[PDB]
Assembly symmetry: none
Homo-oligomer: 441 residues x 2
């Protein structure tokens, strides 16, 4: 979906005032902080809503740095009481209960905004807590926009799932479900496992949030036309969900190597939160070593003196972006994820995908549809522990590191994404569109 | 390629002609369009207009949807035939999915006029076909229609003379200015109004006959989440007009008149003016001493025509209104203040003397008053409230109206801006590009 015509009274107006409410967890906080930055950048005054007291002090620190470093932002405190841990199953995600605590506090918010000057033009709320705030915003006639920080693909799933929910739970395992607006019929096993149990807390949040978003003034999604043209076309053209409100693509919100032939080195990082069985981690080592490609691994389990190598391994956290953009590297080996695709797209790197769980199967589809990533189907998540042997991994790496079909579209993705992040580029146009549409004369 | 789009119109010339213009505009841009025609239409005009159009326009194909008319035992309180046909084709919506099973190339979308939309949305969703509501009226009436469900109890229980705040709309609305049938919850129109106001948030999106220069604050409210929550995309698709070309001169007296000197007066198809009011209206035009073209014992009177022969022409029949409003000799439009009359005056740059008679004509008068291009004398009431205005009063208002040079200049401005919107690569082209791209499948 490309930019709607720009109507604007460029004659005279103050920049609009936007309140912003994040969901819990650094994965949700950082994109929101970037979104709020991007608004402040263009002259909007923003009021950041903090749950008080914070669940995490680090999160509140991140917030503090942001309000101190950027000028148009005020900080507002929202009292929330943590929910009772005993009524939360310990198997399910700890962050779910943190979402429910702050949802509970939405009635406290409408008095808090009454004093506020200049008047609010809108409130932006993370999908993960938005449902009860949408109702509060409606009472005070304040346009409420949902921030969906995962892919446009996940957004289409999350909106379409309630309309096909009976089909999903009636299906027999091994069945494939056709989700509206998405071309590829997909197996139910590709959905996040919790979603399959209707009683499960993730399912209950997923449907609740999927039913809440259509009530919003619109949806701001972390995607861009060059990355997800079909998903965004279907969202803006009523193919995922009838009556959907406007959907605005708001992304992207983002030594040893200098010696190697360019595009020669595979960059592999399974991430801070990766799940690999020790057998599986060891098989990765065997396969990596057997491939014969040059490689840098972010991660004993290796072997004994396994580092007698042409390759490199790194324990310490490092910016994926500097290396991904580096001439030497020609390939990105990583887990699936809305995050990993986006950086590979900015980096112009092809993607070899091993999905960990949950949404990551779905994020693999985002790469595969563009033609810039491969997920070998047997490379399942750690459920039933079907071991993937190093020989298979080595052949797959060689094959991946030779596949210039994937490498070419990734290289085009970098060019198209760079043009989107440029001044006057697609991303600016969508932020200009949003600011203009909520600005009052 | 370009998408295949199906289009469905509502009963009556006022709902058919927009849909015809919308459909022509989509074929103009290389969409192949299927015109779904509920059969049979109420009137021969509608039947003739459809046939001439599809015959005249290359991209279009005609798909007859057979609709059984409303039973006389059904809604007997309402004798209005066009209102009955709204109800009839709304009940025919389940017929449509067998009709569309054949069609190739596959349809990219369907566009349903607002009067009939609610049921056709539900059918379109079952066959997974994006459905767009065409709101052939103004953005003002769209805001009102969308917000009415949310404030209906406060409207029904409010007193006469009370003003009601509707969320998207800039100024509060007097209860007397609402369409009177709305005041009656039992009334079929009010039933349709609530069904439609509730169905439109379910559509893929809403195409509205408006443009930024005409209704900038209502289009901002609709697009900015300030009139209703969960609203789908609203795209202004106007202006839409017919007119004619390569044709003979309709009225040589009008061509012989001086620049902006003639008052063109017309009160539309459903004019509810009384015979007593018509004779007083004729006396007002005569007493004004202004040049005029008026299209509709004798209601005029004895010898009225000979007395008025140098400055007046009264015609009894159809006339192309948009052609007359774009004529260099007319300087004023004395109108029943329809939604379509106000959009046409804006295209032609004519100021409006407004006499709202019924329904949404009052809301239209506010659109024109807001832009400063029209004058609705309060006291010129609903036809249903039988207050007889004297020709001596009509003459004074006509003189003041034709003399308001400042009124004329904003009407001239509006013409200029509206012409920008029509120019290539202007606003309208971009909205239409936007829709076609929105619909188009790779």
């Amino acid at each position: 979906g490309m930019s709607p015509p720009a109507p604007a009274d460029v004659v005279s107006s103050a920049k609009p005032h936007v309140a912003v409410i994040p969901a819990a967890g650094m994965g949700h906080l950082n994109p929101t902080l970037r979104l709020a930055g991007e608004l402040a950048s263009r002259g909007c005054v923003v009021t950041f809503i903090n749950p008080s007291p914070p669940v995490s002090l680090a999160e509140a620190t991140s917030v503090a740095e942001f309000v101190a470093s950027t000028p148009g932002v005020r900080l507002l405190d929202l009292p929330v009481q943590p929910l009772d841990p005993s009524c939360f199953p310990a198997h399910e995600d700890p962050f779910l209960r943190q979402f429910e605590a702050v949802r509970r506090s939405a009635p406290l918010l409408t008095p808090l905004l009454s004093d506020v000057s200049p008047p609010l033009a809108a409130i932006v709320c993370d999908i993960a807590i938005c449902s009860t705030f949408l109702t509060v915003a409606a009472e005070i006639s304040l346009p409420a926009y949902v921030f969906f920080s995962l892919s446009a693909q996940m957004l289409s799933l999350n909106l379409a799932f309630p309309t096909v929910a009976d089909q999903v739970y009636g299906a027999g395992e091994g069945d494939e479900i056709r989700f509206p607006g998405l071309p590829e019929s997909i197996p139910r096993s590709w959905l996040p496992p919790p979603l399959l149990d209707p009683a499960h807390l993730f399912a209950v949040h997923f449907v609740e949030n999927g039913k809440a978003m259509p009530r919003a003034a619109g949806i701001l999604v972390h995607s861009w036309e060059a990355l997800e043209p079909e998903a965004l076309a279907a969202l803006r053209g009523g193919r995922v969900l009838a009556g959907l409100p406007p959907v605005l693509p708001i992304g992207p919100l983002y030594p040893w190597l200098d010696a190697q032939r360019d595009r020669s080195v595979l960059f592999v990082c399974f991430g801070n939160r990766s799940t690999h069985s020790p057998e599986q981690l060891r098989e990765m080592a065997a396969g990596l070593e057997r491939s014969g490609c040059r490689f840098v691994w972010v991660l004993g389990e290796g072997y004994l003196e396994r580092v007698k190598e042409r390759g490199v391994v790194i324990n310490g956290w490092v910016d994926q972006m500097t290396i991904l953009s580096h001439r030497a590297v020609g390939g990105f080996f990583s887990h699936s994820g809305s995050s990993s695709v986006a950086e590979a797209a900015i980096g112009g790197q092809p993607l070899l995908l091993w999905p960990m769980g949950g949404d990551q199967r779905m994020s693999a589809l985002v790469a595969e549809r563009r033609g810039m990533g491969v997920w070998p189907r047997g490379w399942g998540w750690s459920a039933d522990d079907k071991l993937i042997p190093g020989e298979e991994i080595a052949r797959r790496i060689k094959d991946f590191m030779g596949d210039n079909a994937l490498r070419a579209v990734a290289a085009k993705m970098k060019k198209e994404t760079a043009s989107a992040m440029a001044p006057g580029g697609s991303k600016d146009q969508w932020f200009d569109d949003f600011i203009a549409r909520i600005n009052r004369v």
